[PDB]
Amino acid sequence: SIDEQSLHNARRLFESGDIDRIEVGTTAGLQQIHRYLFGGLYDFAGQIREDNISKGGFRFANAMYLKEALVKIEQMPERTFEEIIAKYVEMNIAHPFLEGNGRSTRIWLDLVLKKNLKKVVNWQNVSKTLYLQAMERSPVNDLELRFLLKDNLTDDVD
């Protein structure tokens, strides 16, 4: 029931206009989103992880320098589509939470895209399978991800 309740919570962030009070493009901002989605569901909601984690043969940033990584990641520029995806890709590698990084950082991405390009990702039309592939490859090369997301943008941001 967690996946369900976290979705309802995401549904509520926008419907309530609380999304508009989230800090855009910062670590603190990502933590806000995560806290709001998973508050009361995961007891680590909003908290940077202590432990190391890996998935599908990738290891995310070592917990021991995760906080330091995040300090630099949030400072990355958001001027162009390419720069925003670059930032998104790094924040993914950072993977600051034990769980729920995906939903939360996607929202995080959309807010950056909205602020700087007046656009958001039309996730309806994005294949979950292809997205996951693109992300898996992203650290070595973000071509697949850019190609996937660029023609799935929409300026219909509300």
Ligand X SMILES: Nc1ncnc2c1ncn2[C@@H]1O[C@H](COP(=O)(O)OP(=O)(O)NP(=O)(O)O)[C@@H](O)[C@H]1O
Residues that bind ligand X in the complex, under the rule CB under 6 A: 55-56, 58, 92, 99-103, 135-136
d(CA 116, CA 118): 6
Q: Which DSSP string do the residues of 73-94 spell out, in sequence order?
A: HTTS--SSHHHHHHHHHHHHHH
103: partner contacted, choices a copy of itself, ligand X, none (Cβ within 5-8 A by kind) = ligand X
90: partner contacted, choices ligand X, a copy of itself, none (Cβ within 5-8 A by kind) = a copy of itself
Residue placing its CB nearer to ligand X in the complex, 4 or 118: 4
**8 A C-beta contact, residue 95 and residue 139:** no
**8 A C-beta contact, residue 104 and residue 121:** no
**8 A C-beta contact, residue 145 and residue 85:** yes
- Tell me: does residue 79 bind a copy of itself (CB under 8 A): no
Contact pattern from residue 82 through residue 121 relative to a copy of itself, giving x for each residue in contact according to CB under 8 A and a dash for the rest:
--------x--x----------------------------
Paired residues of 54 in beta bridges? 59
Residue placing its CB nearer to ligand X in the complex, 4 or 155: 4
- Tell me: does residue 18 bind a copy of itself (CB under 8 A): no
